[PDB]
Amino acid sequence: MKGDQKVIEYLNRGLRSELTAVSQYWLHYRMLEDWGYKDLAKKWRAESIEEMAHADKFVERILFLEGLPNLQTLDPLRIGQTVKEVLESDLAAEREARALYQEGAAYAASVGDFPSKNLFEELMGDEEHHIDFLETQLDLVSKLGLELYAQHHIGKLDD
Amino acid sequence: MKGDQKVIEYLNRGLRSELTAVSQYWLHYRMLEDWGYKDLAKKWRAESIEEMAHADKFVERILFLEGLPNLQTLDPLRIGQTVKEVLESDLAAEREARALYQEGAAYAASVGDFPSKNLFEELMGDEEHHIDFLETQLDLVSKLGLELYAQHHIGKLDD
Amino acid sequence: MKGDQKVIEYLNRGLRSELTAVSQYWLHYRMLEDWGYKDLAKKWRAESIEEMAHADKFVERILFLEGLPNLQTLDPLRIGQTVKEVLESDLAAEREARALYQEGAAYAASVGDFPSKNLFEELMGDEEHHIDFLETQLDLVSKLGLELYAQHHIGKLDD
Amino acid sequence: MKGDQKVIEYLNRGLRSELTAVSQYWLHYRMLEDWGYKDLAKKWRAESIEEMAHADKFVERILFLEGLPNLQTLDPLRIGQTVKEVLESDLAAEREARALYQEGAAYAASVGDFPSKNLFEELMGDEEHHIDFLETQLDLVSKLGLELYAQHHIGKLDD
Amino acid sequence: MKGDQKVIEYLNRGLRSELTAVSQYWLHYRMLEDWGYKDLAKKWRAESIEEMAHADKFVERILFLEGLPNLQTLDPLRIGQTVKEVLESDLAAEREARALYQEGAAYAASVGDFPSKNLFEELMGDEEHHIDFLETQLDLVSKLGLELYAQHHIGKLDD
Amino acid sequence: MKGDQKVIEYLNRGLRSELTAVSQYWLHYRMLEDWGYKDLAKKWRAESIEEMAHADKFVERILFLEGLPNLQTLDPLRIGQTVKEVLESDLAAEREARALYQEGAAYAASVGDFPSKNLFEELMGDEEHHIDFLETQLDLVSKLGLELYAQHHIGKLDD
Amino acid sequence: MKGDQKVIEYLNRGLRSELTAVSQYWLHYRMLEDWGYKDLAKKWRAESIEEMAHADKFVERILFLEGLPNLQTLDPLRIGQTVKEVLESDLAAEREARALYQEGAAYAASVGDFPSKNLFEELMGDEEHHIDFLETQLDLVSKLGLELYAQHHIGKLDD
Amino acid sequence: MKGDQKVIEYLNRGLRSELTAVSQYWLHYRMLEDWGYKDLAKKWRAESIEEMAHADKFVERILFLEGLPNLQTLDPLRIGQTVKEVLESDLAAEREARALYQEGAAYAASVGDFPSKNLFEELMGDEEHHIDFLETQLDLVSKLGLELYAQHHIGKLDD
Amino acid sequence: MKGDQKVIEYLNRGLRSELTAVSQYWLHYRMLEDWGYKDLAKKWRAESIEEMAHADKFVERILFLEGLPNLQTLDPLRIGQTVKEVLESDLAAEREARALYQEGAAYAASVGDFPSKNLFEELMGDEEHHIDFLETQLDLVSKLGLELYAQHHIGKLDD
Amino acid sequence: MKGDQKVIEYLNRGLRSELTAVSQYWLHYRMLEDWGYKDLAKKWRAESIEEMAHADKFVERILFLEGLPNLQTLDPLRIGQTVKEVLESDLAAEREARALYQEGAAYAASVGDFPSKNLFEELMGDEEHHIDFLETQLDLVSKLGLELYAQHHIGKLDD
Amino acid sequence: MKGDQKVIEYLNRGLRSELTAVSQYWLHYRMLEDWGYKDLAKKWRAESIEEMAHADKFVERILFLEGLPNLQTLDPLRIGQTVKEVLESDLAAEREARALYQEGAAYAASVGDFPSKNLFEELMGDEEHHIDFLETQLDLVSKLGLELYAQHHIGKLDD
């Protein structure tokens, strides 16, 4: 069904934002695993896979509106080199994603494309829940110090 | 463990190659679904997920060798606009991936990095199996014509 | 609870639109079965029953707002006499339904009747998914020809 | 138990005929798989394995009669390069096998070796059932054309 | 995918070598059964079936590389007329098969055909395990004498 | 149904031959048990019971053809006084039974009594399988010596 | 596969003989049920259904030999008007069927059509077993009188 | 099968290396348990048992190649007297084992002993995974301090 | 808890004696397997694993008494080159182990270290049971001859 | 049975020592629970209940020897007011208990009362295992500091 | 293994003592059953069977030490003619057995035969438990009188 061009442009911007998050969180998952924080690595793997589902929803909506999904490029990755930098890098990215979806939802609403608007609002609520998770981890790091926070999430040793 | 820099560079080249395949095949999956060939869409989804596991293997080996995995960029995507063009696009990409892994394996072998060499040779055998699959689909299209080939894989209607 | 008169008028227009779809798709289901396309008949039966649930949601919301649901009349039915005409007839109807719900949602939003607005937006997303299904069937008919498309969905013979 | 020399010669001719069929049908199975006709490849694999059991019955009967089974050589293989040539090649081979078993059964009957006669007659009935299968596939190819016949047996894509 | 011609020639040599082993061991299985050593007959049947899987692996790789598998001929069969001669015959054949796969692996490695090299090296390790088995049986025959060795493996009488 | 007199005479000769085998093998079963070869005793018990079923088939066919089955007399029993004599005695008897059934089958075939002919041919195949078993036991005795052969079949001691 | 014309003529005569038996025994089944002999009605129903399988085997063999099965006509039916006449009528028919299959088997054997010969011989053994059943029922009627024989097979009353 | 003497010498060197690791890690397991770090003791027990399987693989390959496995001596043990020293001691040993297997694999490859080369390369990849584990523990000790790292792995108290 | 120095010296001598037995019996297990005596190989594997548990008990008791377990060295290994030499070599070793534990138990008793005394006495009873097993195998070899003894324990062939 | 008076006196001293341990460890269990270290409280409860079984064994042995068990008095309790004092208090008590059982065992042995001697030696081994546990907890407190040690054993909060 | 002669003499004295107890308690079991005290008969049967296991342990230890177990003779039996005499007779025997095992254990300990010493001490503890049972029954008889004691153990009547 032919969609509004500008809504499709917002969908493609959101697709790029998710593709960035998928790779940033996957590499952070593998970094946390390499540093030994297996329980943080678990959660980051799961979070990357949630971003993969978001990416796929934008691909599907762009095609239905007869647009061309563009997976060629990512936004710049922010890669942390301590557990606190990983938290701060992902928080920054998620704040940008939330602001993009807020704008995409408002634009879609303005042209009557209510299903695209509900897609952006659903994604904006999901990224606010991830923001809430990341802010809570940074709150623990500030109250306990980074070492006590990270040590609690080393996890169990593999059989 | 500090790795050979040039093996790490081959690993990062392979990581980019897999990231490209993941997105090329995922978009092709969603295209085949949008066109209505649900049985080809199923297989392409599964193939993209196999490429995601390959990508993750390169990330893990790069970090173990104390390199920096680079997920920022992809090789150029080849996007097909008919079922035959999707087959041809993916075959071309997999041929490049196979040659890169052949080279990577021989290079690692030359510096005694036998685990990295075995990672490349395992991936090169997996990409040859995908090349086998794609050449067989193209063989069917040449013997039956594209319409008879595609129509067999429309699949079932969703409940 | 006394509702906005004009929102109730949009709900009653939507009820008529669904009642039309229920009968158009049921008769098309029975036509596809009589022509022998049992797998298309299955999907059309299911689609008619999904429209019956939509009809019932408008009846329930109209009564809660103390309006009088009017089931006396349908919009004009569009009845196809080939598999391609069935697809085109249902697509045309669904485009009109989607535009009505877009308008109903915007009107309800303008008077603060957010539950009626969410009902129209939920229905507008559901009819866009049916539009997507119908457009995909027409895409197959254009790429393969009507005979190859229909033959794939003849289905199995009854015991 | 010492058998009739000439019956043992017919058993050894039958062993060679089965060993030929085993390899002809196995290579055709793998050819049909490489061309993409997975449901024809399935049936040819099974047919080759049925010929393997026939081969083994001749080995066992030759030893019991104190002869020397000769597995060194095959009859000339007939290898098809299209689905129709595969059908015609196997049909030709099976006609020759049936005529050999007819003759072997009659010869064994003439010398009172009724168990060897029943072995040849059992095998001759089994090869007539395969002849019936192959002739039916060629009947479909002549009534529908090779493309419609082969396309129906492409099968499902591997997980 | 077009393969190196000389690797395809090594693959076809290996195919002939396996076809020879399948028939040598199947006939030896049936000989051991006819002589009454049912436990040696069981193992030889199982070993012949392992060789059948090896044969099939060469057929599949030859077709993938667009070569023509040749099942027409076998290498000369070595048929033993005592349990010790069966052991010696099969050991001699497996030594030749091992040397052929060693050569085939080194050749494929030299042209970068790493999947074919891994197929040869996998087969060469499997034939070394069979060489280990056969040398162990010959060791028992030399330490205990052939009659004590063979008598232990008569097995049970059929119901 | 009135049968051919001479076919009934062959059936009655076969009945006497089976009744002889039943008692010869039962007494040999009990002799092998008394000597201690419990696993040979098991097989001989089972073989006697297979001969009992053969005897019963001749009784049933003779009555259906309105003849008088004669169970009054046996052929002379051959009773072995070592394990090798038991094998040789039963082999001699079974060779005579096989020759009788060969002749009975040919005679019945000559008068069109195809069901009696198939009964004799079925029995002739079954006695050839017993001949094969007995010859194999004598082959073991000649290759290993009687003591090693018999000792392997002493069996387990009763609880 | 083109069969011998005269064997196909014997197969078509056998098809007519079975089609006669199917209807004669079905009507006798329903007559015995109407007279009240429910246990004889059960057996006759089952016997008719066994004749239906025989009929189908002749249809299948005639088509495989590229003949034209003729189901248009039956041999004259013999319908009994007492339980003893039913037994005598079916016995007469079965004697004629047995003689036909004897002749068909001998003719097929004479032209080497061993699978058709085995079909006739299998059917001739099956009709001899039915002859045996019918003769036994007439033996009971002669020893006990028709009333005691029939009364024992009245059966149970329907719920 | 007679092996290359120098490959057998590399195998015996590897056997000594594994015997050393088995005892170093078993004693470290029992030390960690005595100090109270029950979760580190669990993993070290499991790692020592993995080294026992490696040792056994060298024994088996040495005997197959007709060499004499030498279990008499170990390389010098490095025993740690703090949790950090145990990590450092085991890392140093595994680095030596990895270099030995790299050398052994390259040497075997040079003489065509591909099964022994694959044994060394498999072991070299397993020791690299253990090196990865030990480097990660040392990374945690450097980022958190030894007391926080060790305290997380005290484990549970025994019932 | 600080132990008696001399008791710890006896514990460390016992640890060396067990470490010797573990490797002597493991290599003998693998030798018996390579010679083909699979049922003797099974028992020797199990016996080596029982010695591994003894070794571990000495490690644990030495640490609890604040001594330093020494795993660096073994006593000289005695490696047999026939089944009888394997039995005699292990018997000699076990006699030395039993005498050591007798002495260790008496010494520990003399200094009141009753738990170490009970450890030595438990181990001395376990090694007497192994002495009993080994002497019984040598008794069989002397009464039956080595060939009949070893042949009974060849075992079953691997699937 | 009348026992040795002095052995009964040692049994009664041991009964008093166990009764002291039961109450010291039960009160420490309840103290650790009141301070919040639920996982240390669990282990101390279990340890007190193990001491209750020891107490009961002395009661039973004293009565069998016709002595009078005296439960009226305890040795002085040592009650800790920090987690480290609890560990040190219980360690001191257990050292005294171990020395008493060592002496009781030696005395009983001197008068031939071997069952009482084995009771004391069994108890002395059990108290050495508790000494080992307590020393390990104090080792953790010295390596990690009391706070990190105790915090790891706070446990879970009650539902 | 050659044992100490005098320890073997003590083992043989213990074997005689157990063989006496087995028969004394079995006859008392059967006497108590004949008098009607079925619950005392149950316990005496079980006690005799416990003595049978003791007897067997002495047989096994005597043979392992290469002595000759002597089962030819018993010590004099003490057979009671009232329930109280049965208790007193068995108590007297068990006191003698306990004193013998005390002496045997001390002697074995003096020559370092610690496994024989532990066998005697285990048996001495088991006979003290039986002494305890018998003394308790005599205590009941003295406190309640023989009639009330015996009547409580008459038991239930057999079905």
Ligand code: HEM
């Ligand atoms: C186009 C970008 C991607 C999309 C649209 C995508 C989509 C998906 C989806 C939808 C799934 C779950 C599939 C299911 O559960 O049925 C999945 C799984 C997974 N993806 Fe991705 N993915 C993408 C990129 C990546 C990247 C860049 C990696 C790692 C480098 C990755 C690694 C994985 C893995 C390992 C799984 C399966 C995990 C498991 O089975 O536990 N994906 N992906």
Ligand code: HEM
């Ligand atoms: C002497 C010639 C051969 C004989 C007598 C023979 C006999 C047999 C028999 C009797 C079986 C089934 C065994 C069972 O189910 O227990 C079997 C299985 C098989 N054979 Fe053969 N075979 C022969 C040649 C071949 C050839 C030439 C190939 C392929 C190149 C082949 C591939 C196989 C495979 C793959 C199986 C097992 C299939 C499965 O498990 O699904 N065989 N063969």
Ligand code: HEM
């Ligand atoms: C320090 C010397 C050793 C000690 C203390 C030791 C200890 C152990 C223990 C306690 C087990 C059983 C573990 C369980 O069942 O949870 C075990 C298993 C085993 N050990 Fe050892 N071991 C030692 C040396 C060896 C040697 C030298 C080898 C072979 C060369 C060996 C091969 C094995 C194997 C293969 C297993 C597992 C067997 C199975 O799972 O069936 N061990 N070892």
Ligand SMILES: [Fe+3]
């Ligand atoms: Fe997202």
Ligand SMILES: [Fe+3]
């Ligand atoms: Fe997010």
Ligand SMILES: [Fe+3]
């Ligand atoms: Fe890949």
Ligand SMILES: [Fe+3]
């Ligand atoms: Fe791929």
Ligand SMILES: [Fe+3]
């Ligand atoms: Fe609707």
Ligand SMILES: [Fe+3]
């Ligand atoms: Fe709709």
Ligand SMILES: [Fe+3]
């Ligand atoms: Fe065949």
Ligand SMILES: [Fe+3]
């Ligand atoms: Fe065939």
Ligand SMILES: [Fe+3]
């Ligand atoms: Fe092979």
Ligand SMILES: [Fe+3]
């Ligand atoms: Fe092989």
Ligand SMILES: [Fe+3]
């Ligand atoms: Fe018979």
Ligand SMILES: [Fe+3]
């Ligand atoms: Fe027979």
Ligand SMILES: [Fe+3]
């Ligand atoms: Fe019939």
